[PDB]
Design a protein around this ligand. Structure first.
Ligand SMILES: O=C(O)c1ccc(O)c2ncc(N3CCNCC3)cc12
Ligand code: NI
Ligand SMILES: [Zn+2]
Length: 351
């Protein structure tokens, strides 16, 4: 009731923490949730200006991108499917040269709405290369605030208990973008949170649908791609499906849009569908994390049913540790708990 009164429009919120607020990562997430941020599914956090995670990005031209992917997009009328074509390894220097070449570079424009229109007009032409899923971090070893290599959230329980690492999920990924490279509509694996920091370059634009409206987006997508939906219980997790804002408007799906600049963080929340594109040559770092509120999403995440090497995290350790009274009921398949997408994580109490 009090949570439904905070950010009731479920618009994307933007925060400007001071250094003292910034220092404690998990505490700040709880705070923005206490302000209703999660209701949007996506939030922006602008870090204090005296903060930098790396002195210089002049020394990484030799960094290898082992598996660049060329993004072939097919479709019309605002509905598309993206096919990946893996290309040969290349260095950042090589990647940047291609990105900034006349062939792949960002078109000229005035307002963002103009670039956005060009993206949706030309997305099936001249398929770009995305230097995605590069294992690594660009943080200096001694950065202790919002360090994507070690956020110290309860997601650490996975590795801690089982030794299991899942690349990009409890380890960091780098993404080197160029004009018109895309990320398709999806929620995170196991419906986890994610953090995304744009180290440098041109912006990355995002779309998001409130978790409270996630099911509507799913119903729409199933009607649009009945073949894919029949074959898999969670086809959007393939991350191949692109849907334009006009199409969302046309079918009454609530969504917001936000543009991320170099030096800014984006947080995505459990069950927040999102998608977007890069404006030009840029570099982003990301990984997943959890709070106590995520556990229930974890137990209920509807998972891809047709592919091996799909991400599945055993929820057992979390339920034992944080929901001991529900453990036996849950193991017996009788845990009928219903998720309230508006409630902030328990850690937010102090706020
Ligand atoms: O591309 C982005 O900036 C991006 C932004 C936000 C997300 O939640 C993403 N999730 C997955 C993803 N892909 C890239 C292609 N290989 C599989 C992982 C990219 C992103
Ligand atoms: Ni993602
Ligand atoms: Zn599947």
């Amino acid at each position: 009731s009090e949570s439904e009164t905070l950010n009731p429009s479920a618009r994307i919120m933007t925060f400007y923490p001071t250094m003292e607020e910034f220092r404690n990562f998990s505490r700040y997430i709880a705070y923005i949730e206490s302000q209703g941020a999660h209701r949007a599914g996506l939030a922006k956090v602008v870090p204090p200006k005296e903060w930098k995670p790396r002195a210089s990005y002049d020394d990484i031209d030799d960094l290898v991108i082992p598996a660049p992917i060329q993004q072939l997009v097919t479709g019309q009328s605002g509905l598309f499917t993206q096919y990946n074509i893996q290309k040969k390894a290349m260095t950042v220097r090589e990647f940047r040269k291609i990105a900034n070449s006349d062939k792949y570079c960002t078109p000229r424009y005035s307002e963002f709405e103009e670039l956005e229109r060009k993206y949706w007009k030309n997305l099936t032409f001249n398929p770009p290369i995305y230097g995605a899923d590069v294992n690594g971090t660009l943080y200096e070893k001694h950065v202790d605030e919002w360090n994507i290599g070690r956020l110290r959230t309860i997601l650490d329980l996975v590795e801690k208990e089982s030794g299991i690492t899942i690349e990009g999920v409890n380890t960091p990924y780098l993404y080197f973008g160029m004009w018109k490279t895309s990320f398709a509509w999806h929620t995170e694996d196991m419906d986890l949170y994610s953090i995304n920091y744009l180290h440098f370059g041109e912006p990355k634009s995002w779309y998001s649908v409130p978790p409270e409206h996630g099911k509507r987006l799913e119903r729409l997508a199933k009607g649009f791609f009945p073949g894919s939906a029949q074959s898999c219980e969670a086809f959007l997790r393939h991350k191949m499906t692109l849907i334009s804002p006009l199409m969302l408007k046309k079918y009454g799906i609530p969504f917001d849009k936000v543009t991320q600049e170099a030096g800014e963080f984006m947080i995505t929340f459990p069950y927040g569908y999102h998608a977007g594109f890069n404006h030009g040559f840029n570099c982003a770092e990301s990984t997943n994390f959890a709070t106590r509120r995520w556990i229930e999403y974890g137990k209920q995440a509807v998972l891809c049913s047709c592919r091996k090497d799909m991400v599945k995290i055993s929820m057992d350790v979390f339920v034992r540790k944080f929901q001991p009274e529900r453990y036996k009921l849950w193991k017996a398949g009788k845990d009928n708990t219903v998720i309230d997408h508006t409630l902030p994580t328990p850690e937010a109490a102090e706020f």
